[PDB]
């Protein structure tokens, strides 16, 4: 079931795009789960670091991107609302995941 | 000017030391690192400059005033 | 020509605009031709709008102008709609 | 007191423009709102300019340049011409 | 008396009509709820300001000018109801 | 020259030949990939120069459909492509020379096709200045009027609407301050499916209405996207009863028919106090 | 990867020149605030005669290379390439004269 | 106006019941609210239709609404 | 750091300004502010364009994406 | 002087904006958009300058012109 994660909007997940596919990311107690073709399951034990990009320089990007690095590659989740950045970072730090902010 | 900068007797001396081929720049960088690290200490490296030339192979030239500094 | 509108050949009230500019807390002092200039601009703009509203009401065979014709006039004029792009018209 | 509105002036302007046309009450409410809104915009921008330039008086130059800022090209040109004409003739008279 | 869950008073035809006036031909079934939420968030943002004005005037009735100022603050100027 | 639709899955350049009663496309790689088009079967012959395009076009719209490879088509397009601070400005001038060269050669060839037809085929060119943007299929494209047709030839699938075959045009989504509208063409042959052109910018509405009037096409406007699958099947079932009850003339209802208005305030153009 | 600054004669990595600029020439060149073209026009990766200076004030070598008023570090006797005409004119506007280190001027 | 006048009134009162208990309303406040709400929604449906046409579609879906509100700068 | 070269942007600014009044002078800080604002604007526009392109299930941004973003913002009519 | 905005600069601006692939007409489209933006902003600034009876365009004119558009800029004396 959904974990202890609650978005700024009190929602159990966040809207994001993985490549050209729009969908929902769920931060569950043991894993990150993206529920939209293609479905992506990422256990926290397999995650090396999460990199968050909020504009990579000048101009405030209203929507930020999350790159999840793991032993088999990286997944970039794009178009996440910036208000959801702090709740996601605090939850991932709480789960013992290394968060890097460019 | 340029002509006035020619050396005098009271200018610091220059010594040349033979080293292994291809390691001249390595010795120059090590000397610079030691000079920077020992700067501000009780026994700093009392030298002034050091260099080398590609054409003059196997030679490293250090400008100082005492052989003990070399 | 007693009224200041007459001395300027206007229909809008110069005196009321003067009073509103003074009793409105905009600046310590007010000129003598600023109310005249502003009344002229306002009258010109209202005439500009009413021309096109009359045109639109005459294209719909109507004698009275209603909010529909004002909406049509504004959204059909390139410059007026640019001026009034962030304005909602009730019953338009 | 008797509420102030620009209704009679809009009737005058309308008869000047369209003698055989009439305006509804709601269209007059809209026109009054428009006139008030434009007055507020222009006076606020004139005050902003006066404060920007450390002045304590609103003269016709501030109003003219406010019209230049707010109105688009042809509208600004015609409204500036109309205002200068009216101010010139009021001064002359 | 307290009002409970009156959002469903925005029945399917109102939203469909509103879409037709907007030029929409085919409407997915998830739209109606989407729209309802959007509208809620809008009204809550406008009303919170209108009420703020009403309470500051030390009044107990929400007047049309309070709504007009609340809209004007968001760049939503409305002609027809005063101004 | 490249041909569309291609006779094989491989894009190959060929040579186009003029013959006594038609044209022949012939690939150099295989003799079996010939495409023969008779002059009697060409309905419309279009030429389109590189006015903004990376390509030059000779398009044949057909009366009867042909079987090119595995595809049935009414349209056969022959084309070639130009594509391959003062130095970059000069490189644009060299591209403008290459455009003008291919334009002159392909226009001349399309005129020579028209001459070889003994006056059966007129050479049409698009009026680019009268063009408007819209979505007939899945992409936004520039729709170009010609003398006798409304065309789009740059992207597949091609649009070719003959103006004389139109019975009525309907403008859907047109109402109070709308961002965009749709245009629907109904044909005189009710068995032919209606053609939709979507998202035409509302800025082009008055231009499209004028253009339809200048071409003698009746139009009507509506706030709602009327279904034509329903409208046509009813009209096909009894075309006579349809016209008996007012056809589309009654549906038009141009008369505003609005007299209720919103009352009026005391009419007094007199200064008060 | 290392480049030799044409004006002052110091040698630093090219990425150091791009990110932080020349510690001595930043008052007149603005190398850190300059694009890659200006960095290449003022810092050259092709050089000869690596020089390490410890004490600028008393080293006769530093005076001979006119680097006795600069930060100690890696220096080059000869640097390939010269400053462009516009940069030379800009330096002449500041009142600073540019003496080439290419060896061709003496 | 397409929405009615009494369900909308009840919705407005229900929403207003959170910010201050037992608040009266005025002649032209609910009407203005309905006009603004319908104008806003029509503009939003215009943008949604534009996005849906952009996606080569004719059906508007919730992700088009979300994209429109994201580009408008809506939270 | 600013991604446009300074002199081209200054020349463009002067070319544009010369169409409203001849012999105009610009403080260097005015050009710097203009460049900052223009790049910030362009980056925000490119972010919206990227969002539109991803919405259409693509990777390549196209002029129609820019036009759609500018229309939805309310910049083009 | 509008050709001074080279293709690499537009590519750089798109990469900082997160754009992965770029069409060939994007450059001309961007040049047009930038020209429109700059035209409006410089027109407002020159209006401010003329009103202040100056021949030099200051940073205050640009800052007020951006505040006029709604593009408030910090760090230039506002
Ligand atoms: Zn240097």
From Swiss-Prot, chain D:
The modification Dimethylated arginine is found at residue 48. Monoubiquitination at Lys-3 (H2BK34Ub) by the MSL1/MSL2 dimer is required for histone H3 'Lys-4' (H3K4me) and 'Lys-79' (H3K79me) methylation and transcription activation at specific gene loci, such as HOXA9 and MEIS1 loci. It also functions cooperatively with the FACT dimer to stimulate elongation by RNA polymerase II. Phosphorylation at Ser-5 (H2BS36ph) by AMPK in response to stress promotes transcription. The modification N6-lactoyllysine is found at residues 12, 54, 77, 85, 89. GO terms for biological process: antibacterial humoral response; antimicrobial humoral immune response mediated by antimicrobial peptide; chromatin organization; defense response to Gram-negative bacterium; defense response to Gram-positive bacterium; innate immune response in mucosa; killing of cells of another organism; negative regulation of tumor necrosis factor-mediated signaling pathway. Keywords: Acetylation, ADP-ribosylation, Antibiotic, Antimicrobial, Chromosome, DNA-binding, Glycoprotein, Hydroxylation, Isopeptide bond, Methylation, Nucleosome core, Nucleus, Phosphoprotein, Ubl conjugation. The modification PolyADP-ribosyl glutamic acid is found at residue 4. Glycans are attached at residue 81. The modification N6-glutaryllysine is found at residues 3, 12, 15, 77, 85, 89. The modification N6,N6-dimethyllysine is found at residue 26. The modification N6-acetyllysine is found at residue 54. The modification Phosphoserine is found at residue 5. The modification N6-(beta-hydroxybutyryl)lysine is found at residues 3, 54, 85, 89. The modification N6-malonyllysine is found at residue 85. It is found in: Nucleus; Chromosome. The modification N6-succinyllysine is found at residues 3, 85, 89. Belongs to the histone H2B family. This is Histone H2B type 1-J. It comes from Homo sapiens. The gene is H2BC11.
Curated annotation (Swiss-Prot), chain E:
The modification Phosphotyrosine is found at residues 32, 69. GO terms for biological process: chromatin organization; negative regulation of megakaryocyte differentiation; nucleosome assembly; protein localization to CENP-A containing chromatin; telomere organization. There is a cross-link at residue 72 (Glycyl lysine isopeptide (Lys-Gly) (interchain with G-Cter in ubiquitin)). The modification N6-(beta-hydroxybutyryl)lysine is found at residues 12, 58, 72. The modification N6,N6-dimethyllysine is found at residue 1. One of its GO terms (molecular function) is RNA binding. There is a cross-link at residues 1, 12, 40, 60, 72 (Glycyl lysine isopeptide (Lys-Gly) (interchain with G-Cter in SUMO2)). Acetylated as part of spermatogenesis progression prior to histone-to-protamine exchange. It is found in: Nucleus; Chromosome. Transmembrane segments: none annotated. The modification Phosphoserine is found at residue 28. The nucleosome is a histone octamer containing two molecules each of H2A, H2B, H3 and H4 assembled in one H3-H4 heterotetramer and two H2A-H2B heterodimers. The octamer wraps approximately 147 bp of DNA. Found in a co-chaperone complex with DNJC9, MCM2 and histone H3.3-H4 dimers. Within the complex, interacts with DNJC9 (via C-terminus); the interaction is direct. Interacts with NASP; NASP is a histone chaperone that stabilizes and maintains a soluble pool of Histone H3-H4 dimers. This is Histone H4. It comes from Homo sapiens. The lineage of its organism: Eukaryota, Metazoa, Chordata, Craniata, Vertebrata. The chain holds residues 21 to 103 of 103 of the full protein.
UniProtKB/Swiss-Prot annotation, chain H:
The modification N6,N6-dimethyllysine is found at residue 20. GO terms for cellular component: Barr body; chromosome, telomeric region; extracellular exosome; extracellular region; inner kinetochore; nucleoplasm; nucleosome; nucleus. Changing residue 22 to H: In BRYLIB1; uncertain significance. Changing residue 69 to H: In BRYLIB1; uncertain significance; decreased protein abundance; increased interaction with DAXX; not changed subcellular location. The modification N6,N6,N6-trimethyllysine is found at residue 20. The modification Phosphoserine is found at residue 27. The keyword Cytoplasm does not apply. Acetylation is generally linked to gene activation. Acetylation at Lys-63 (H3K122ac) by EP300/p300 plays a central role in chromatin structure: localizes at the surface of the histone octamer and stimulates transcription, possibly by promoting nucleosome instability. Keywords: Acetylation, ADP-ribosylation, Chromosome, Citrullination, Disease variant, DNA-binding, Hydroxylation, Intellectual disability, Lipoprotein, Methylation, Nucleosome core, Nucleus, Phosphoprotein, Ubl conjugation. This is Histone H3.3. It comes from Homo sapiens (Human). The gene is H3-3A.
Swiss-Prot record, chain J:
One of its GO terms (molecular function) is RNA binding. The modification N6-(2-hydroxyisobutyryl)lysine is found at residues 7, 20, 35, 53, 55, 67. It comes from Homo sapiens. There is a cross-link at residues 7, 35, 55, 67 (Glycyl lysine isopeptide (Lys-Gly) (interchain with G-Cter in SUMO2)). There is a cross-link at residue 67 (Glycyl lysine isopeptide (Lys-Gly) (interchain with G-Cter in ubiquitin)). This is Histone H4. The nucleosome is a histone octamer containing two molecules each of H2A, H2B, H3 and H4 assembled in one H3-H4 heterotetramer and two H2A-H2B heterodimers. The octamer wraps approximately 147 bp of DNA. Found in a co-chaperone complex with DNJC9, MCM2 and histone H3.3-H4 dimers. Within the complex, interacts with DNJC9 (via C-terminus); the interaction is direct. Interacts with NASP; NASP is a histone chaperone that stabilizes and maintains a soluble pool of Histone H3-H4 dimers. Changing residue 16 to H: Found in a patient with a neurodevelopmental disorder; uncertain significance; results in early developmental defects when expressed in zebrafish embryos.
